[PDB]
Amino acid sequence: DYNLTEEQKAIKAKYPPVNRKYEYLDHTADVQLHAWGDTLEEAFEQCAMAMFGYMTDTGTVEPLQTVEVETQGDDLQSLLFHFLDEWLYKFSADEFFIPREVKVLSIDQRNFKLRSIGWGEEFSLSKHPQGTEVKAITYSAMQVYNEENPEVFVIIDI
């Protein structure tokens, strides 16, 4: 939860809220993200939105521009890692993109390939509430469950 300007509240009211299927467990130097959904694809996209949700109130981001992230791994855990790593790099460099919403179109469970898409705009300290900088994705405790109730767990450094 953040404190919003009047302008930020107005943008949040103009766009549909994103359903939140994630939660945080805070520690001194890192945070565990837990995300879930009806599909593994939904658990992945919720994990990405949980990550960006730690940096700002993504409800205040306008869905002006579209950005695609495609990636591969050697298993589902490393696929998740590189998926989050690539989205974090879209934010931290180049176009400094912050997604309001992320969608995972497909995960190839055989080859560990993924296609995803996000809608958003350039991050800006004046338009977007300041949250906490995500310094890195860590790989020490990736967890992926891909049975009846898909869910993922990841630790990010702050």
Author numbering: 22 to 179
Please, what does the article write about this entry?
RNA ligases of the RTCB-type play an essential role in tRNA splicing, the unfolded protein response and RNA repair. RTCB is the catalytic subunit of the pentameric human tRNA ligase complex. RNA ligation by the tRNA ligase complex requires GTP-dependent activation of RTCB. This active site guanylylation reaction relies on the activation factor Archease.
To discern between the different conformations and oligomeric states, we crystallized human Archease (isoform 1; UniProtAC A8K0B5) and determined the X-ray structure at 1.84 Å resolution. The electrostatic surface potential of Archease is predominantly negative with a slightly positive region around the N-terminal helix. Residues 22–47 including helix 1 and β-strand 1 are located at positions equivalent to the swapped elements in the dimeric structure of human Archease. Helix 1 and the following loop possess high B-factors suggesting increased flexibility in this conserved region. No metal ion was bound in our Archease structure, unlike a previous structure of the PhArchease dimer, which harbors a calcium ion. Formation of the RTCB-Archease complex, as presented here, is only possible with the monomeric form of Archease due to the sterical clash with a strand-swapped dimer. While our results do not exclude a functional role of dimerization in vivo, they support the monomeric form of Archease as the functionally active state.
